Design a protein around this ligand. Structure first.
Ligand code: HEM
Ligand code: HEM
Ligand SMILES: Nc1ccc2ccc(CNCCc3cccc(F)c3)cc2n1
Ligand SMILES: Nc1ccc2ccc(CNCCc3cccc(F)c3)cc2n1
Ligand SMILES: C[C@H](O)[C@H](O)[C@H]1CNc2nc(N)[nH]c(=O)c2N1
Ligand SMILES: C[C@H](O)[C@H](O)[C@H]1CNc2nc(N)[nH]c(=O)c2N1
Ligand SMILES: [Cl-]
Ligand SMILES: [Cl-]
Lengths: 362, 362
């Protein structure tokens, strides 16, 4: 059954991929080669062209992603050759460097060897390569609550955080054959951070807020033609609301809205004053302003939605079905000011794609 | 088949309704009476108790409604007795008066005779009893674009609007047996309107914005135990975002955001300035402030969401399933600041309920 599942996905993917690459005539010979290889070995190996286009298709098919217009310019790094933890570490370090690109962020994915018999070759524990630690003890809350369980797992392994609100978590990953993951402190020279200031309100810097420049998601599985790349970190650049409306705003995250209201000089006493809404707007203006000022790529939600409209238009004229998750595509502020809010989307799952997978801690 | 459909819904409704009213023992005798009546007449007549509780249940089951906490205090007016257009007119006038209640809005429904053989007894053309007209000709846009087709239909019938941006549409409805609806101008003494001013920004009154006090939805069908009340206008009070984030903000409605930005003294040139977001917040603060100042009931979206949380809690402890439409329950501004955004809802349709129906014009 596993072999049949693999072969079916392989047939679907190779046909579609080669059609898009104008290589339709080669499909017949390639599929035969694949069928023999699966019969012989239980699996098959993608060509570099297949892997690159597959990672791109998977981004294109990500229903929840508003940034899909740029799917075809994804920078794919093939690291199926790594065998050692030093190599994995250095590949991760390299990804941070090349994706960051001095602030001019390059959308990038680094692809590690895939699962064999469902057996992982490399197992990355980080949610993102750059992420802040979180602590909770005796009612005391420090840093990012969403990082509490990973932080606790790191500290089991001999890591110790400084317990600022912005401790950088180490890289942590496990190799096939090892019972325990290893961890490495991030070289600070690789990590760009942005202090949050406001264009008009000088007092905003009193909050001493900051965020990291590049979100590099490292815990999703890339699936391409029935091959499972559980370890394949990728990045784009941030949409501002991700930071200003969620990471810094949510009560279960950094929960900064009351403090924002105070520094912008409004009362936080009455729902009818819409103080949360006003605070959200100013914090979000601050985030966009700060990233731009530092020369780190970012997009606002209006521009992002305009790009997504073009993605919809592009899909139609290319004759491809559009899929999307309305509930995630709408931005968490002024959603009705975007075209997204006013239409619907088919939420069917199409492969290649990126998928959630179980945490190895917890 | 129609009779079977009716009887099945009747059985389901009477059982549930009488359970809730502690009248479970009476179900057996009532259902027999109903079965005979359907056999004899093709239909059945609700008791006053059944009708009142049915209209309440239908509100409770409205998946898209954030205001459901107060479902049980709905004021039900039984007008199944009306036979003439003067009576219908006067009932509609009465509803406006009693619901308005000098600004202290009473949630109210007036129920007219139901469809017979799918044959309407009274057919109301208005979307709401109080609503502004809309005009479009030679590129010239006046009033509410969403009212353009009804406005045009009214003007076919000899009505003429003054062509201000806030012309009150007349009541328009058709009686069984008539080929044409009749229309009646609304007495202005019945209609409360609210001028939009801002608490801090004096210039806001330069926009000369206003809205009506009470939204009285008059084009949905109430269904109760297989009986179709196509004519049954109802009202609550507004949630502020309905006016400030949609009616006055949408590009296809009054489209006021650029003008709002100008009077609050910000540029409307760059997406990254989040000028639409800031304008939306101030316009919405203005709406809430204005209604409160005039003594007309209104709720903000934060308070409304807090009430809805209590509705969820109430449903659970009463042992009732909760149903909801996430995409409509989230407010169109700062949705992630409400608990609604962070959970999911079962969107199953449960009866009694309110339903859309085809427009008799267009
Ligand atoms: C280039 C800039 C990009 C922008 C501005 C962008 C924007 C976004 C945003 C705002 C989200 C919602 C995230 C959340 O609320 O947690 C998202 C989700 C997502 N994006 Fe993108 N994205 C970009 C690039 C990429 C790239 C390069 C990939 C992969 C190759 C990708 C795949 C996804 C996926 C899989 C999700 C869903 C994650 C989940 O379900 O939790 N995006 N994107
Ligand atoms: C008491 C104050 C009330 C508030 C604050 C409230 C709030 C809301 C809001 C904000 C909407 C969304 C409307 C839109 O975006 O177009 C809504 C929808 C709805 N409400 Fe309520 N509501 C209230 C009372 C009522 C009453 C009295 C009924 C009927 C008895 C009702 C039934 C509905 C229905 C059926 C919808 C869906 C309409 C549609 O699909 O277009 N509500 N409510
Ligand atoms: N700009 C982008 C691009 C791709 C992304 C892909 C994934 C994500 C994060 N999605 C999950 C966020 C999350 C999940 C669970 C807990 C939590 F705190 C936060 C953000 C992205 N941002
Ligand atoms: N406060 C309330 C309560 C109940 C409501 C019930 C219905 C509505 C309106 N829902 C449809 C609005 C609409 C539909 C179609 C076109 C349009 F311009 C506007 C608003 C309500 N507001
Ligand atoms: C938190 C919960 O999953 C919620 O229903 C969804 C709604 N839509 C979202 N949309 C985005 N972009 N990101 C999110 O985290 C969520 N959360
Ligand atoms: C306009 C379109 O129907 C859109 O998908 C929905 C989204 N959610 C909504 N929610 C509310 N409360 N009201 C609306 O008109 C809409 N519009
Ligand atoms: Cl993030
Ligand atoms: Cl309305």
């Amino acid at each position: 059954e596993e072999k049949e599942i693999l072969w079916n996905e392989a047939k679907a993917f190779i046909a579609a991929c080669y059609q898009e690459l104008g290589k339709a005539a080669e499909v017949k010979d390639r599929l035969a080669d694949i069928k023999s290889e699966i019969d012989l070995t239980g699996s098959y190996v993608h060509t570099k062209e297949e892997l690159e286009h597959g990672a791109k298709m998977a981004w294109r098919n990500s229903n929840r992603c508003i940034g899909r217009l740029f799917w075809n310019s994804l920078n794919v790094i093939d690291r199926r050759d790594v065998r050692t933890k030093e190599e994995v570490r250095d590949a991760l370090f390299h990804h941070i460097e090349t994706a960051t690109n001095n602030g001019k962020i390059r959308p990038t994915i680094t692809i590690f060897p895939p699962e064999e018999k469902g057996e992982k070759q490399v197992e990355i524990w980080n949610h993102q390569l750059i992420r802040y630690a979180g602590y909770e003890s005796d009612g005391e809350r420090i840093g990012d609550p969403a990082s509490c369980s990973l932080t606790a797992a790191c500290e089991e392994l001999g890591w110790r955080g400084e317990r600022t609100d912005f401790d950088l978590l180490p890289l942590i990953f496990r190799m096939k054959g090892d019972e325990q993951p290893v961890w490495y402190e991030l070289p600070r020279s690789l990590v760009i951070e942005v202090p949050i200031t406001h264009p008009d309100i000088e007092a905003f810097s009193d909050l001493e807020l900051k965020w990291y420049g590049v979100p590099i998601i490292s815990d999703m599985k890339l699936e391409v033609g029935g091959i499972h790349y559980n370890a394949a970190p990728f990045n784009g650049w941030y949409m501002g609301t991700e930071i200003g409306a969620r990471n810094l705003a949510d009560e279960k995250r950094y929960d900064k809205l009351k403090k924002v209201a105070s520094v912008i000089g409004i009362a936080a006493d009455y729902n009818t004053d819409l103080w949360k809404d006003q605070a959200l707007v100013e914090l979000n203006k601050a985030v966009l302003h700060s990233y731009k000022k530092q020369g780190v790529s970012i997009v606002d939600h209006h521009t992002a939605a305009s790009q997504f409209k073009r993605f919809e238009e592009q899909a139609e004229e290319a004759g491809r079905k559009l899929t999307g998750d309305w509930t995630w595509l709408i931005p968490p502020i002024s959603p009705a000011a975007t075209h997204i809010f006013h239409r619907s989307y088919d939420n069917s799952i199409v492969k290649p794609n990126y998928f959630y997978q179980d945490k190895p801690y917890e």
